[PDB]
Amino acid sequence: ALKPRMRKIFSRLIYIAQSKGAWIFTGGTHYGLMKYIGEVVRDNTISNVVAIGIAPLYCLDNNHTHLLLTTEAKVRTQLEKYISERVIPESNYGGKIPIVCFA
Amino acid sequence: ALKPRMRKIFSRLIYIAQSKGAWIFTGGTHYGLMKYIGEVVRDNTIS
Amino acid sequence: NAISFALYKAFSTNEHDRDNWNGQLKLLLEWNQLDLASDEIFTNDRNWESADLQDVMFTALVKDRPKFVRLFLENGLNLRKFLTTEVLRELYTNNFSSLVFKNLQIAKNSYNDALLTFVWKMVEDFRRGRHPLQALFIWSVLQNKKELSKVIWEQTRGCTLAALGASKLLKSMAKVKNDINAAGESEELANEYETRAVELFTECYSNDEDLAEQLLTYSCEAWGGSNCLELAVEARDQQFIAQPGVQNFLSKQWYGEISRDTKNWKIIMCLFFFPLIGCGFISFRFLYYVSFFTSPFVVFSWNVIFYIAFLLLFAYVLLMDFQKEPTALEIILYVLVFVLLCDEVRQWYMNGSKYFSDLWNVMDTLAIFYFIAGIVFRLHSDESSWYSGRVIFCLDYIVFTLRLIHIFTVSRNLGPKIIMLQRMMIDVFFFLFLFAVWMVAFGVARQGILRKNEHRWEWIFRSVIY
Amino acid sequence: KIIMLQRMMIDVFFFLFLFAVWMVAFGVARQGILRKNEHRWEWIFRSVIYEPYLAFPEWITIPLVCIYMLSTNILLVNLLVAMFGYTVGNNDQVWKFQRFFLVQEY
Amino acid sequence: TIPLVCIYMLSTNILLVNLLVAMFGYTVGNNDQVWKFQRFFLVQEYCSRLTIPFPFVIFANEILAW
Amino acid sequence: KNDINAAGESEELANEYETRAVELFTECYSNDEDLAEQLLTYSCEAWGGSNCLELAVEARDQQFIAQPGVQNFLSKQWYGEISRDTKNWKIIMCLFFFPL
Numbered sequence: 034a035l036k037p038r039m040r041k042i043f044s045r046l047i048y049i050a051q052s053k054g055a056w057i058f059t060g061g062t063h064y065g066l067m068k069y070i071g072e073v074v075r076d077n078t079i080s081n082v083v084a085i086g087i088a089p090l091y092c093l094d095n096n097h098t099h100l101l102l103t104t105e106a107k108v109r110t111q112l113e114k115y116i117s118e119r120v121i122p123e124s125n126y127g128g129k130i131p132i133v134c135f136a
Numbered sequence: 137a138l139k140p141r142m143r144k145i146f147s148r149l150i151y152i153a154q155s156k157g158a159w160i161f162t163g164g165t166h167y168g169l170m171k172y173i174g175e176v177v178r179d180n181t182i183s
Numbered sequence: 184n185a186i187s188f189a190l191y192k193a194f195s196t197n198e199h200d201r202d203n204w205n206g207q208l209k210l211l212l213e214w215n216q217l218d219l220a221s222d223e224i225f226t227n228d229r230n231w232e233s234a235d236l237q238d239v240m241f242t243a244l245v246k247d248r249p250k251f252v253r254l255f256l257e258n259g260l261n262l263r264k265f266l267t268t269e270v271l272r273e274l275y276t277n278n279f280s281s282l283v284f285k286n287l288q289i290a291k292n293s294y295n296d297a298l299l300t301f302v303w304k305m306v307e308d309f310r311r312g313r314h315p316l317q318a319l320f321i322w323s324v325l326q327n328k329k330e331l332s333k334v335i336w337e338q339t340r341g342c343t344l345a346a347l348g349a350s351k352l353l354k355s356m357a358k359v360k361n362d363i364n365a366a367g368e369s370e371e372l373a374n375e376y377e378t379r380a381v382e383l384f385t386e387c388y389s390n391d392e393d394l395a396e397q398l399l400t401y402s403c404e405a406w407g408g409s410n411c412l413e414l415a416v417e418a419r420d421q422q423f424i425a426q427p428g429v430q431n432f433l434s435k436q437w438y439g440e441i442s443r444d445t446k447n448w449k450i451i452m453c454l455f456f457f458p459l460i461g462c463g464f465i466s467f468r469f470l471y472y473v474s475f476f477t478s479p480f481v482v483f484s485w486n487v488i489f490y491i492a493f494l495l496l497f498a499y500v501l502l503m504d505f506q507k508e509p510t511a512l513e514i515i516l517y518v519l520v521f522v523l524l525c526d527e528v529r530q531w532y533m534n535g536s537k538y539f540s541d542l543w544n545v546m547d548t549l550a551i552f553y554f555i556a557g558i559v560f561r562l563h564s565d566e567s568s569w570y571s572g573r574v575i576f577c578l579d580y581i582v583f584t585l586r587l588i589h590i591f592t593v594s595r596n597l598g599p600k601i602i603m604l605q606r607m608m609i610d611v612f613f614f615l616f617l618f619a620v621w622m623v624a625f626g627v628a629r630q631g632i633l634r635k636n637e638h639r640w641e642w643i644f645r646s647v648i649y
Numbered sequence: 650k651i652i653m654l655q656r657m658m659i660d661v662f663f664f665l666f667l668f669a670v671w672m673v674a675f676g677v678a679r680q681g682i683l684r685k686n687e688h689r690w691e692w693i694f695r696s697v698i699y700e701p702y703l704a705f706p707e708w709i710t711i712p713l714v715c716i717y718m719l720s721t722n723i724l725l726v727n728l729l730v731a732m733f734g735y736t737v738g739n740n741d742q743v744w745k746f747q748r749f750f751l752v753q754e755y
Numbered sequence: 756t757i758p759l760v761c762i763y764m765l766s767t768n769i770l771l772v773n774l775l776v777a778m779f780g781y782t783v784g785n786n787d788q789v790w791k792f793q794r795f796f797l798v799q800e801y802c803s804r805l806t807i808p809f810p811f812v813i814f815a816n817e818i819l820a821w
Numbered sequence: 822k823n824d825i826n827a828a829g830e831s832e833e834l835a836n837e838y839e840t841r842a843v844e845l846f847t848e849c850y851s852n853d854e855d856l857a858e859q860l861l862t863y864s865c866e867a868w869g870g871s872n873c874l875e876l877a878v879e880a881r882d883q884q885f886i887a888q889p890g891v892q893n894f895l896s897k898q899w900y901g902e903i904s905r906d907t908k909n910w911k912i913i914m915c916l917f918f919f920p921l
């Protein structure tokens with residue numbers, strides 16, 4: 034249920050991620066919020082978010098620019114810990130690349 | 137932190153002390169509220 | 184408010200940023216967390232020195248944080264010692280947006296003013312190479328930093344001035360139609376600097392009124408080079424000048440050193456009879472006559488009764504006198520026109536070729552230029568030009584009455600009817616122009632019908648009109 | 650209508666005064682042109698007023714009509730300013746007091 | 756002669772309309788503030804004159820703590 | 822005027838589609854103004870066959886056309902490719918003298 038409040042959260046978030054140049058890891062399928070997310074990243078690459086998707090058979094979301102198709106929600110954890118350890122000498126968050134997990 | 141409320145207290149106080157002719161004992165140093173206090177006593181010895 | 188509140192918690196609980204509190208400030212400055220930074224960083228149980236706050240303030244300006252520039256100032260920051268000249272040129276050369284800077288060049292050219300020539304010089308020599316706090320306020324009011332320029336305004340030394348001068352810098356850039364949104368936001372920002380300077384003056388006027396009016400004519404040490412009152416009339420700040428503080432100051436100025444509580448006629452009964460000033464019949468405030476004849480009420484009252492008595496000896500020289508010799512009654516009528524001309528060469532000063540754009544100062548100037556032709560037609564001794572010199576004196580008697588009528592037309596209806604008049608006066612100027620266009624049409628349709636059909640000269644270029 | 654009237658009545662009192670000032674001007678520019686040029690007495694102090702009430706072009710006829718455009722402006726403007734002098738200037742209370750002050754005078 | 760009076764109806768229209776548009780050009784267009792500034796601008800133009808009579812024209816930082 | 826109530830409810834519903842299209846355009850005009858004016862003259866693939874601006878003038882939507890977005894677009898159209906910041910007389914002094 035993408036409520037008019039629930040679409041206020043996940044569209045202000047895309048503009049915030051545009052002002053910072055973030056990545057968005059999500060379930061790369063053509064349903065739910067994940068379909069609504071991909072429509073906003075498609076519409077906001079004209080104004081620098083990169084939406085990486087990680088996944089009967091579910092239809093694939095045709096709005097994630099890089100797709101990463103149980104046995105797959107373990108490289109998602111392996112990915113973020115390599116990112117969260119990764120020190121960068123720009124060093125505004127003490128380096129270490131700030132991670133948020135929206136649930 | 138001389139807040140806009142914290143400067144409301146210590147500037148109404150100077151005018152109250154002006155209407156009564158008081159003394160103000162404070163830490164005589166060029167910092168903090170004590171610097172902000174001394175600016176109001178400088179500006180209120182003209183009235 | 185949820186991401187930065189979550190990201191701050193994972194940063195703060197690393198147990199190594201107690202010394203590195205400066206990391207938590209730039210984190211909370213990259214986002215907009217005023218209430219979190221004021222409670223958990225600037226709360227005085229931690230040891231900071233407020234001298235390494237200067238590289239954080241420079242990012243708090245150029246990243247458009249109008250709430251943190253107020254926070255660093257209320258936590259102690261000497262802004263008149265922070266604003267060094269290399270800091271100010273990092274703003275105008277790097278962090279001044281090129282769209283507003285290209286908007287400034289078009290603002291400087293098509294609407295040229297003494298204020299804008301000061302600002303266009305200021306952006307230029309800051310992009311080339313003291314009162315510095317009055318330069319940061321210019322930096323934030325050009326680019327319409329609407330919440331940030333309210334903070335820098337609160338630090339300025341004289342703020343009855345700088346709220347009005349920024350109200351001019353906006354309104355002179357709110358007419359550039361390259362971006363009507365940026366010209367629209369500059370218009371609504373200047374209205375709340377008018378309003379910011381109205382109540383700052385009425386509070387200055389609810390106290391001692393003589394203390395307030397000294398601030399209206401302050402020299403300002405050449406901020407814009409103008410005073411607070413002259414900065415308002417050139418910017419057409421109608422809300423500032425229509426307040427009862429300033430309109431009282433003009434009425435105290437126009438009556439001058441005479442008090443306004445004598446009567447109206449009580450001054451006029453002293454213009455005729457000079458011994459009545461020396462009594463207590465006037466209540467002005469040793470040689471009160473210099474205070475009397477220098478107040479602009481009696482100056483304007485002299486130049487009407489002298490101008491009325493100018494015409495009654497202009498009529499007397501035109502009926503009894505004016506036989507063949509320019510007699511003694513005409514030589515004073517010669518020099519009084521020259522006296523009425525020798526101020527117009529000073530009205531030829533401070534005009535800028537636009538004080539002749541009221542269509543009534545020119546009718547006063549074409550009056551005197553029609554009078555010198557009557558002098559040229561006078562001393563020629565032939566009866567064909569003597570009578571032709573009498574006729575362009577008599578037509579000039581109307582114009583020297585139409586100046587006097589235009590004096591009475593304005594000076595009675597000077598009030599709420601001064602916008603009804605002089606907007607209507609151009610509207611009848613337009614109507615009689617459309618009448619005279621129609622009379623040329625009706626002349627041709629009368630000349631093209633009646634006789635002398637083909638009997639043509641340069642007669643026809645002048646007969647069809649009259 | 651007692652505030653519309655008697656504010657307008659002074660406004661036409663002012664306009665006809667500016668008309669009579671102009672008629673003295675147009676009288677002099679009529680007496681100073683026609684004959685009895687130098688035939689003068691205290692005749693002239695009283696003839697110049699009533700004479701417009703009962704009523705060579707080398708380049709001078711074109712400013713004369715420009716005078717007849719400037720003169721008819723500044724009198725017509727004062728006519729219409731007299732037409733709307735009541736308009737400028739709680740309008741309910743101000744006429745009931747002026748209605749009260751006239752009847753209490755009577 | 757019948758369009759000539761139609762001209763004498765069309766000509767007297769477009770001049771009479773411009774007469775009455777001139778009669779109410781002041782009406783269109785905060786009305787209190789706009790006349791006090793125009794009252795201010797005229798007197799300050801006359802206060803910008805020399806404050807001497809007509810025949811004589813040929814003759815011619817601690818307050819901020821408050 | 823067969824049913825003035827249904828003709829009255831259609832009148833007050835159209836006023837909150839005017840108002841629904843005023844603020845949807847001023848938000849489109851508070852952003853890039855050249856991007857907004859391309860939407861005013863869109864071909865629409867024959868929805869009614871008209872553009873958004875021509876649909877407003879035939880419906881006499883006075884609230885939509887009197888907004889400062891569209892009235893700026895006309896003044897930028899009537900001055901044309903000349904900028905509006907030259908002067909008024911500056912164009913007129915170029916009509917007489919072609920080298921200027």
Ligand SMILES: CC(C)CCC[C@@H](C)[C@H]1CC[C@H]2[C@@H]3CC=C4C[C@@H](OC(=O)CCC(=O)O)CC[C@]4(C)[C@H]3CC[C@]12C
Nearest residue numbers: 433434437438447451483484487488491594595597798
């Ligand atoms: C006897 C005859 C030959 C002489 C008549 C004298 C008048 C021509 C003079 C003397 C009194 C004068 C007036 C005295 C008071 C003023 C008020 C003044 O109104 C204002 O308040 C100005 C606006 C302002 O600054 O407040 C305008 C001029 C006026 C009418 C003066 C205009 C000319 C007057 C009528």
Ligand code: NA
Nearest residue numbers: 717720721724
């Ligand atoms: Na006339």
Ligand code: NA
Nearest residue numbers: 763766767770
């Ligand atoms: Na006619």
